[PDB]
């Protein structure tokens, strides 16, 4: 029996609810991923021109009922519960990683924010014009990394860096 199919303490080999898909859930820091933590044989990383002094990513923003603004260009009566927003946004990621819909094509489609026209792309910007806590934040993710539902003031939204 292979013991290497196990995970180090803190990591729990979990499964998707009613789906049967197996992934890795770290209950220590609450992190989650599908790639083996020690799978350093092949790391994902795209080539981006320019150092982390400026970056360019794409995001999918979903607004909920109790948001700063309950209205948008596509829906002015946005009344969706937080559980709904989470399940729909996580559902999008799942089809993306499955190669069903690309983040770009999908973001331009399901973006609740005004970034829909730009396919979720925020553009390439340099440090200075960011909020103090977010300024150093912009430069943390590299080209090829996609995070899940991040909880900021604006609401629930995912992110993917392209440059």
């Amino acid at each position: 029996m292979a013991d290497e199919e196990k995970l180090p303490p803190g990591w729990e080999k979990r499964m998707s609810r009613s789906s049967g898909r197996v992934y890795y859930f770290n209950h220590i820091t609450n992190a989650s991923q599908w790639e083996r933590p020690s799978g350093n044989s092949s790391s994902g990383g795209k080539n981006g021109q320019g150092e982390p002094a400026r970056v360019r990513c794409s995001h999918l923003l979903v607004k909920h009922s109790q948001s700063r603004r309950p209205s948008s260009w596509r829906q002015e009566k946005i009344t969706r519960t937080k559980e709904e927003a989470l399940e729909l946004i996580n559902g999008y990621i799942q089809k993306i990683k499955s190669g069903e819909e690309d983040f770009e094509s999908l973001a331009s489609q399901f973006s609740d924010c005004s970034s829909a026209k730009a396919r979720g792309d925020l553009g390439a910007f340099s440090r200075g014009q960011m909020q103090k806590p977010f300024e150093d934040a912009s430069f943390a993710l590299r080209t090829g990394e996609m995070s899940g539902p991040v909880f900021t003031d604006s609401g629930i939204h995912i992110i993917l860096r392209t440059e």
Binding site: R14, S16, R17, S19, R21, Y23, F25, N26, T29, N30, A31, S32, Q33, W34, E35, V55, R56, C57, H59, L61, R68, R69, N90, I93, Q94, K97, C113, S114, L122, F125, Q129, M130, Q131, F134, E135, D136, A137, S138, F139, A140, L141, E145, M146, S147, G148, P149, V150, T152, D153, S154, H157, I159, R161
Partner: peptide
């Protein structure tokens, strides 16, 4: 349970509030 890959440590980027956009 969440399912999609989400890194607790490295998840920071232009997450909307990187500018005056929205908030």
């Amino acid at each position: 349970v969440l399912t999609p890959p989400d890194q607790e440590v490295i998840r920071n980027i232009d997450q909307s509030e990187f500018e005056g956009f929205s908030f």
